[PDB]
């Protein structure tokens, strides 16, 4: 679509000659961005993204107990998911009353789903997370893109060999002990509405396949996850920066930043 001009903009020269990052891979093989802390001006993204007037809806799951996560996760996602920018909070849950109202920003809307078209029509990119987790540094449009997928913190350093992917040639999700790129979390993933749906299409309709054979795969939807993401290239791939456990991994030098975190 038609993009008009960036406007006069002050900022370091990129240097050729200088590399990003040492310590990390921040491109894969298929041309697509690695985002860590370093690579982007955000002051430049944000310029891009919102000239467009983009809208991101986040969608979270909240069932029973879950429900109880809510509050921090609002609270934080307020203070640092895609700020400045319009943002759809869509929170699928079993219980509708016990959803806390969370003081909003402006341009910023939540609506409560009781447990689709909806979503090409109200907002450009979807996210979709965990419940119990917490912001504690930004996450913004440096994100957004047709595909994504979210380096798991607990394999992002291992073999593919490794990787818990499904093993079993019985499952619709099976990737064999030669393939795969990385290893994705289930936990955060997104892009464009239409890449969004096709995914979660796919990965229902082989989901069903294997419930009909008699079969789970060993990580369930996130099985079924990184079999979609292995065929079909994410336009970008998140840092662990973008989904972290402290209590369990620590704080390595090679993250700079610890941006959304699980909840103990
Ligand atoms: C080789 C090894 O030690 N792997 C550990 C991982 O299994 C742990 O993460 C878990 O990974 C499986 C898939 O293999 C699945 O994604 C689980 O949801 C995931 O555990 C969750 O996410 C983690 C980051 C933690 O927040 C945990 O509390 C969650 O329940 C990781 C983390 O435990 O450690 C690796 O050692
Ligand atoms: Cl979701
Ligand atoms: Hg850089
Ligand atoms: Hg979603
Ligand atoms: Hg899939
Ligand atoms: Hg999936």
């Not at 973008?242 to 975190?261: E, S």
Request: charged share 20%; aromatic share 12%.
């Amino acid at each position: 679509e038609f993009m008009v001009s960036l406007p006069r903009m002050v900022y370091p020269q990129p240097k050729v000659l200088t590399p990003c990052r040492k310590d990390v891979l921040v491109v894969t093989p298929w041309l697509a961005p690695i985002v860590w802390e370093g690579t982007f001006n955000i002051d430049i993204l944000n310029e891009q993204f919102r000239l467009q007037n983009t809208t991101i809806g986040l969608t979270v799951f909240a069932i029973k107990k879950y429900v109880a996560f809510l509050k921090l996760f609002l609270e934080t996602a307020e203070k640092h998911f895609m700020v400045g920018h319009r943002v759809h909070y869509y929170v699928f849950t079993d219980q509708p009353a016990a959803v806390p109202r969370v003081t909003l920003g402006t341009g910023r809307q939540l609506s409560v789903l009781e447990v689709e078209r909806r979503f090409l029509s109200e907002v450009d990119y979807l996210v979709c997370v965990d419940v119990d987790m917490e912001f504690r540094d930004h996450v913004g449009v440096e994100i957004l893109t047709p595909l994504f997928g979210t380096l798991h913190p607990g394999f992002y350093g291992s073999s593919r060999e490794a990787f818990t992917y499904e093993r079993r040639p019985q499952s619709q999700a099976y990737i064999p002990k030669d393939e795969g790129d990385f290893y994705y979390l289930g936990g955060f993933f997104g892009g464009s509405v239409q890449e969004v749906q096709r995914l979660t299409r796919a990965c229902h309709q082989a989901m069903m396949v294997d419930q009909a054979n008699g079969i789970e795969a060993v990580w369930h939807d996130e099985s079924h996850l990184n079999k979609y993401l292995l065929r079909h290239k994410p336009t970008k791939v998140l840092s662990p920066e973008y989904l972290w456990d402290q209590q369990l991994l620590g704080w390595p030098a090679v993250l700079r930043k610890l941006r959304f975190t699980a909840v103990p």
